[PDB]
Amino acid sequence: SKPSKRSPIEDLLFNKVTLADAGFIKQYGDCLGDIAARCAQKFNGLT
Amino acid sequence: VVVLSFELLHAPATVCGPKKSTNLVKNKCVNFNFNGLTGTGVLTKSNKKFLPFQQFGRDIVDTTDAVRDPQTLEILDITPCSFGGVSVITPGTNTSNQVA
Ligand SMILES: *[C@@H]1O[C@H](CO)[C@@H](O)[C@H](O)[C@H]1NC(C)=O
């Protein structure tokens, strides 16, 4: 019944762990945030 | 003997270059020189509120994030121009020379 077709236990495991990086395309974000907030935010060459 | 003593670490300078000012490009990716601070990036309207004595701002990692325009006092955010890695997908030169 839920997206990703994970078990009740797997969603619990995923909700408990906080992922700092979560790699995906991030260039679209750019500014308008309170601050850039990163872990280079790509800008310093680390992805 | 004449000794000229100054510090270049104070952002709101009021003294020193016979440079010829031009317009502000804003959104398009450009090179810039703001009171001796130079670089490449995209200048956009900022929502940040600078104090009367603050010319420059910095991000979490102490690099320049935003500037105060020397003539208009508009606060502009500086986002570096888009860049990234290039990866080459090759079937192998013994099969085909097509590349993604
Ligand atoms: C600089 O001169 C322009 C001339 O139109 C004026 O509008 C602007 O406010 C001036 N800025 C400062 C900081 O004196």
Chain B: nearest CA to A25, how far in angstroms? Answer: 10
Q: What is the largest CA-CA distance in chain B?
A: 76
Say how far apart CA B56 and CA B67 lie, in whole Å.
5
What backbone phi and psi angles, to 5 degrees, belong to B78? Answer: -110, 110
Residues facing residue B34 across a β-bridge: B37
Say how far apart CA A47 and CA B65 lie, in whole Å.
19
Residues facing residue B14 across a β-bridge: none
Way the structure was solved: cryo-EM
Q: To which H or E segment does residue A11 belong?
A: helix A8-16
| CB-count burial class (<10 Å; 0-12, 13-18, 19+) for B50 | middle
Residues 6+ apart with CB under 8 A from B77: A31, B43, B44, B45, B46, B48, B65, B66
Say how far apart CA B80 and CA B90 lie, in whole Å.
31
What strands, in cross-sheet order, belong to the sheet with B75-79?
B30-34, B37-45, B75-79, B64-68, B56-58
Q: How many residues does chain A have?
A: 47
Q: What is the resolution of this structure in A?
A: 2.9
User: Is the Cα torsion angle B41, B43, B46, B52 positive or negative in sign?
Assistant: positive
- The answer to whether the CB atoms of A32 and B79 lie below 8 A apart is no
- The answer to whether the CB atoms of B77 and A31 lie below 8 A apart is yes
* DSSP designation for B45: E
Chain A: nearest CA to B79, how far in angstroms? Answer: 7
SS3 B42: strand
Say how far apart CA B69 and CA B56 lie, in whole Å.
10
Q: Are B14 and B64 in contact (CB under 8 A)?
A: no
The verdict on B79 touching A (C-beta cutoff 8 Å) is yes
CA count, 13 A, side-chain hemisphere, B4:
3
Disruptive mutation site among A30, A31, A42 for chain B (greatest number of B CBs within 10 Å): A31
